[PDB]
Paper text:
The spike protein of SARS-CoV-2 mediates viral entry into host cells. The spike on the surface of mature virus particles is in the “pre-fusion” state. It is a homotrimer, consisting of three receptor-binding S1 subunits on top of a trimeric membrane-fusion S2 stalk. S1 contains a receptor-binding domain (RBD), an N-terminal domain (NTD), and two subdomains SD1 and SD2. Here, we used nanobodies (single-domain antibodies) as probes to investigate a unique epitope on the SARS-CoV-2 spike protein, located outside the protein’s receptor-binding domain.
In the current study, we discovered three more nanobodies, named Nanosota-5, Nanosota-6 and Nanosota-7, from the same alpaca immunized with prototypic spike. We determined the cryo-EM structures of prototypic spike complexed with either Nanosota-5 or Nanosota-6. The structures revealed that Nanosota-5 binds to the NTD and SD2 from the same spike protomer, whereas Nanosota-6 binds to the NTD and SD1 from two different spike protomer. The epitopes of Nanosota-5 and -6 are both located outside the RBD and do not overlap with the ACE2-binding region. NTD and SD1 bound by Nanosota-6 are from two spike protomers. (B) Activities of three Fc-tagged non-RBD-targeting nanobodies: Nanosota-5-Fc enhances pseudovirus entry, Nanosota-6-Fc enhances pseudovirus entry at low concentrations and neutralizes pseudovirus entry at high concentrations, and Nanosota-7-Fc neutralizes pseudovirus entry at high concentrations. To confirm that FcR did not play a role in the enhanced viral entry, we repeated the SARS-CoV-2 pseudovirus entry assay using His-tagged nanobodies (named Nanosota-5-His, etc.). Both Nanosota-5-His and -6-His enhanced SARS-CoV-2 pseudovirus entry despite having no Fc tag. Therefore, two of the three non-RBD epitopes on prototypic spike enhance the cell entry of prototypic SARS-CoV-2 pseudoviruses through an FcR-independent mechanism.
Author numbering:
A (entry chain A): 14 to 180, 184 to 310
B (entry chain D): 311 to 624, 630 to 676, 689 to 705
C (entry chain A): 755 to 827
D (entry chain K): 2 to 119
E (entry chain A): 952 to 1050
F (entry chain D): 952 to 1001
Amino acid sequence: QCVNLTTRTQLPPAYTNSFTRGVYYPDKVFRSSVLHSTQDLFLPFFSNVTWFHAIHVSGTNGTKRFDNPVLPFNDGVYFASTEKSNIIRGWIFGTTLDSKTQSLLIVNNATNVVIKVCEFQFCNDPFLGVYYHKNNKSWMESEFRVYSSANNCTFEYVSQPFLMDLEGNFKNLREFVFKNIDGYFKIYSKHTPINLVRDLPQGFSALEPLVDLPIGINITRFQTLLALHRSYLTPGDSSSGWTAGAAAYYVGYLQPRTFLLKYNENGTITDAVDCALDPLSETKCTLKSFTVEK
Amino acid sequence: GIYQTSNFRVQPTESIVRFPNITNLCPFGEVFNATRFASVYAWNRKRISNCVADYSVLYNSASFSTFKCYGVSPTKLNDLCFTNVYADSFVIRGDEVRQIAPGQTGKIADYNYKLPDDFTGCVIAWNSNNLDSKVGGNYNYLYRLFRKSNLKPFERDISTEIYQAGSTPCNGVEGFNCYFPLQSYGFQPTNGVGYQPYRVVVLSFELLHAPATVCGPKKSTNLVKNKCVNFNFNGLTGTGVLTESNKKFLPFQQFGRDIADTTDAVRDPQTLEILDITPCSFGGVSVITPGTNTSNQVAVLYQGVNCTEVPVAITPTWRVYSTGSNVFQTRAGCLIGAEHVNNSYECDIPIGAGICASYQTSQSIIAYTMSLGAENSV
Amino acid sequence: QYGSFCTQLNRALTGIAVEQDKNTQEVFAQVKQIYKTPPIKDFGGFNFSQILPDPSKPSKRSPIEDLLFNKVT
Amino acid sequence: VQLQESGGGLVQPGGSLRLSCVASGSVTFNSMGWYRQAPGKQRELVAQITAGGDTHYADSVKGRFTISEHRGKNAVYLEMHSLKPEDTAVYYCHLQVPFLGGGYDYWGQGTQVTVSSG
Amino acid sequence: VNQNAQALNTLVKQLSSNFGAISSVLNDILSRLDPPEAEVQIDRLITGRLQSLQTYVTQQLIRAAEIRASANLAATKMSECVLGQSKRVDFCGKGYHLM
Amino acid sequence: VNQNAQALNTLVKQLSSNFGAISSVLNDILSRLDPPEAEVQIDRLITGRL
Ligand SMILES: *[C@@H]1O[C@H](CO)[C@@H](O[C@@H]2O[C@H](CO)[C@@H](O)[C@H](O)[C@H]2NC(C)=O)[C@H](O)[C@H]1NC(C)=O
Ligand SMILES: *[C@@H]1O[C@H](CO)[C@@H](O[C@@H]2O[C@H](CO)[C@@H](O)[C@H](O)[C@H]2NC(C)=O)[C@H](O)[C@H]1NC(C)=O
Ligand SMILES: *[C@@H]1O[C@H](CO)[C@@H](O)[C@H](O)[C@H]1NC(C)=O
Ligand SMILES: *[C@@H]1O[C@H](CO)[C@@H](O)[C@H](O)[C@H]1NC(C)=O
Ligand SMILES: *[C@@H]1O[C@H](CO)[C@@H](O)[C@H](O)[C@H]1NC(C)=O
Ligand SMILES: *[C@@H]1O[C@H](CO)[C@@H](O)[C@H](O)[C@H]1NC(C)=O
Ligand SMILES: *[C@@H]1O[C@H](CO)[C@@H](O)[C@H](O)[C@H]1NC(C)=O
Ligand SMILES: *[C@@H]1O[C@H](CO)[C@@H](O)[C@H](O)[C@H]1NC(C)=O
Ligand SMILES: *[C@@H]1O[C@H](CO)[C@@H](O)[C@H](O)[C@H]1NC(C)=O
Ligand SMILES: *[C@@H]1O[C@H](CO)[C@@H](O)[C@H](O)[C@H]1NC(C)=O
Ligand SMILES: *[C@@H]1O[C@H](CO)[C@@H](O)[C@H](O)[C@H]1NC(C)=O
Ligand SMILES: *[C@@H]1O[C@H](CO)[C@@H](O)[C@H](O)[C@H]1NC(C)=O
C-alpha cells in the first residue's frame, strides 16, 4: 500500500552545466582510428540540466522532504546520479501513471531488480522505505510502497537475488540514457568512481548499451523512486535523510543533433564535437578533423 | 610493346553457410488458423522471434487467394534472416483487398490500415465465407468511416469518440452531424463475392543490422579459413579470404567497417569468434611482346600480385604459360615467360620499378634492370 | 547494354599513366653519361658536401635530399 | 543486447564436459556463476565464482565440478566431471553486470548439456 | 598528394549511395528480389556509379594536363638554369644568375 | 591523326547500343509501338545518345 509524507517546505531549483556529457554508441559496428560523423538524438553540449537534491533539506538540522516531481519524457532523457549510499532505486514511466493506461516500472527493491509492465495504480508519493537503524540492530530493511493494484502484467523480468553490503566520501556516478522508438525501450549506462564532488564534473565517457526491451507502449511522463531512510510517523532524533541531500540527480533531454565521434585504435569513443554548437565546431565538422589551420 | 589485354581474379573454390543454432518452430498456425480475427480499426499484433520459419508451406498451401509480396520475393523468403516478424490480422471485404498495398488512398487505407511507402513484407488474404459469415449476419466486425485526419503508418486508433461533422459539438451524444464511431459489417452468405468475408494477414519483416532470430530452414557448414570462399553469415553474403583478426570487439557489436562501405570484419554466429574479411585477389594481365616481325613468343605480367597464387587464378588455361621459364617477382608483379639477366641495357619495353624487357639472342625475351648510361669520369 | 563506355575510361587512365613516365623522363634524363666527382675536394674553398651524395647513408642521397624526403608524407 | 553465450553437448554417464559460456567481449561483473534447469522443477544454483575469487558451490556439486576463468580470454569455465543422469538439464550462465547497484543477469542465453547413456 | 588522395577517397565513398534504389549493396538486391525488379534497381545503381566514374576520370584528365604543364616548365628550367647560364630576368631566381 | 580517327569511330559505333530500350533502331521502335510506350523507349535512347 501507499503512505503519505508529512513535511514538504520549498527551495528554488538549481541548474548545472553538462559539458561533454552523455554520449552513447549509436549503432553496433566496429571502427578503428577513424573519426565518423553520425546523426541521432544526443544531449547537446553545454546544456542546462535541472538539478534535484534527493533529500530536499530546509535546514541541516533534520528538516527534510523528498524531491521527486513528475517530469516529462520528450524524445528521450539523459539521467545521471551522484550518490554514496544507493538512495536512487529506479523510475516509473507512462502517460497518466494510473490504472487507465499501462505503465513501466524498473525498481531495484534491494533483493533484486524487477521490471514489470502492468496497469499499476500509482500513488502521489512513491518511495521505498529503509529501516536502516529503526530496529534494535543495525541492518537495512526495505519497504515497497510504489503502487496499490497491478493488472495486465504483460512483461516481467526478475533478477537473481543479491545483497548490498557496506559495513563516507566514495560517491559514484551512474549515467543513463532512456529512449523509446518503434515500440522498443533502450537503456544505456555507465559507472564511474568519483570522490568529493559538489555536482557532476567535466570529462568524457561513452555510454554502452545495456538492454533493448520490446515493451511497445506510450511514454510521455516519468517519475523517480527514492529510498526513504526514515519512517513516516516518527523516524527518529533528527537528520533522517543521509547527509542532508548530498545524494542528487540530474535530468537532460535529447534532441536531434549531428556529432563527429572519434574512435581510437581499440574501437572506443574518446572524443566528439557538436557541429551546431559554435562556428569553430562547424569548421571542424565541415573540414572533418579536430584541428584547423589558418 | 606491352599491352593490357584483360584482368584476372582468383575464383572462389568453396561456399560456406553459418546460421544461428535456433531449433524451434514458428507458430504460423495460430495467426492463420485463429477462429476469431480482429476488427478493421483495431486489428492485432503478434510478434514472432526465436524460431525457424518454413515459408514454403504457406506459399504452396494453395488455400490463400493472394500472396502479393513487397520488397522480397516469396520464393527467396526461406534463405533470408530477419530480426523478428510482425503478424497482423483482420477481416476485409473482397473489393477492399486492394487498399492494403502501400502508396494507395482508400477508406481502409486512410482510416484503418496505412502501410508505409517503404514497406517490406507480404500480405496474405483468403476468403472466409464458411467461417466468418452467418445466416443472421456477423456484425462483430466494425467499420471506421469518419476520422479527423489520416492515420500514420502502423498506427492503431481505438478511441470511440463521436466525431463532429458539423459546427455543433456532439459532446459524446449522437444526433445532427454525429454518427456512430464504428459501423458494422454485413457479413451474410447472400452477399456477393465482392462482399464476402476475406481474412487478411500482413507480415512485416525487419531487415536490420542486429542479431537474427527468424532464420529460415537451412543448414550450417564448417568454417574453412585461409582460402577464397563464398561466405553467408546471418544472411549477409560475399566472397573473400578470412583469417583470425585481433580487433577487440565490444560485446554488443557485430560488424566492422573502416571505410564505411566494406565490412572488413564479422562475428561468427555460432561460435562467438571474430574473423576478418579480405578480397581474394585481382589485377591486370599484360602481354609483353616483340613485333610479329620478330617472333611470336610472348611474356605475361600479372600486375601487383603475389604469384604463388598465379597458377590457380583463372579452355585457355595456360596458367603458368612456360613453367620452365623461371618465374620471379618484381615490384610490378611476377613475369612469366622471360629469363632474368644480370647485364644491363637501355630500356625498350618498360615494365616497372626499373625492370625492362627486350628480345635478343637463340633469341628469347629477357628481363633486366635498365642502365642509365655509359659511365664516365672527368 | 551501354556499349563501350567502359573501354574509353580505361584508355584515358592508361594515357595519363604513360604521360607521367614521359614527364619524369623528359625532366631528369637530360645527360647521356654518368659523371662522378673526384675523391679530392680541392674546389678552391667551395664546400659542396650538403648537395653532394653521401656514401655513409644507406641510400646515396644528399643531406638536403634526405630533409626533402622526410618533410613530405 | 550486450552479451551472448553458446555451446552444449550430449554425454553418457561417467564422462566429463568442458563448456565455457563464452563471453561476446570483455565485460565487467561481480559474480559469474553457473545455473541449470530440467523440465519439471524450478531453476537451481550449481556454482558461482566472483571477481575476488570466492567459489560458492551447491550442496550436490562438491568434489565433482569446478569453475575456472581465463582473464586473457574473458570466459568462465566450469569443469564438469563424473556425470550422472540426474545432472541432465539445460545449462546457463548468469552475468552479474552492475545495474542500479547490481542486477539484470544475462542467464537467458544458455546451453544444453544432457547426461544420458542412450 | 592530398588532391589525389581526396579524389580517390571521394570515389570510394560514392559506393555507399542508393541513387534512388532500395539498397546500396548489390548482393542484397540480388539475394532479396527477382530479376524483373532486380533489374529495375540495378539500373539505378549502374547509372549512379557510371556517372561517378566519369566525373573522376574527367577531373583526373584536367589535373594531369596541369601537371604536364608544370613538368614542361621544370624541364625548361633544368635545360637553361642548370646546363647553362641564363640572361632571362627572374627565370632562375632574383638577382644576376650565376649557377 | 589516330586519336581523332579513333574518337570519331567510337562516337559513330555508339549508335548501335540499346541503353536499356527494346531496340537501337529509331524507325523499328516507331513502326511497332503506339506513342505511350514508344515515348519511353525514345527517352532511353535519347539519354544514352546525349
Ligand atoms: C497526502 O494527502 C492525502 C492523504 O493521504 C494523499 O491522498 C490524496 O490526496 C489528494 C488531495 O491532496 C486527493 O486528491 C487524492 O485523491 C488522494 N489520494 C489517495 C489515494 O488518498 C495525498 O496523496 C498526499 N499528498 C502528498 C503531497 O503527499
Ligand atoms: C664541409 O662542410 C661540412 C659542414 O656541412 C663540414 O663538416 C663539419 O666538420 C666539422 C669538423 O670537421 C664538424 O665539427 C661539423 O660538425 C661538421 N658539420 C656537419 C654538418 O657535418 C666539412 O668538414 C666541410 N669540409 C671541408 C673540406 O671544408
Ligand atoms: C540556465 O540555468 C541557469 C541556472 O544557473 C538559469 O538562470 C538560466 O535561465 C538557464 N538558461 C536556459 C536557457 O535554460
Ligand atoms: C537548524 O539548521 C537550520 C539551517 O541553518 C536553521 O535554520 C535552524 O535554526 C536550526 N535549528 C536549530 C534548533 O538550531
Ligand atoms: C501517448 O499518450 C498521450 C496521452 O497521454 C498522447 O498525447 C500521445 O499522442 C500518445 N503517443 C502516441 C505515440 O500515441
Ligand atoms: C522485491 O520484489 C520481489 C518481486 O516482486 C518480491 O518478491 C520481494 O518480496 C521484494 N522484496 C522486498 C524487500 O520488498
Ligand atoms: C486487464 O485486466 C483486467 C482485470 O484485472 C481486465 O478487465 C482487462 O480486460 C485487462 N485488459 C487487458 C488489455 O489485458
Ligand atoms: C489448422 O490446423 C490443422 C491441424 O491443427 C491443420 O491441418 C490445418 O492445415 C491448419 N489450417 C491451415 C490453414 O493451415
Ligand atoms: C550448435 O553449434 C554447435 C557448434 O557451435 C554444432 O556442433 C551443433 O550442431 C549446433 N546445433 C545444431 C542443432 O546443429
Ligand atoms: C615487318 O615484316 C616484313 C616481313 O619480312 C618486313 O619486310 C618488314 O620490313 C618488317 N618491318 C620492319 C619495320 O622491319
Ligand atoms: C608473398 O610473396 C612474398 C615475397 O614477396 C613471400 O615471402 C610470401 O611467402 C608470399 N606469400 C604467400 C602466401 O605465398
Ligand atoms: C648475377 O650475378 C650474381 C653474382 O654476382 C648472382 O648471384 C645472380 O644470381 C646473378 N643474376 C642473374 C640474373 O644472372
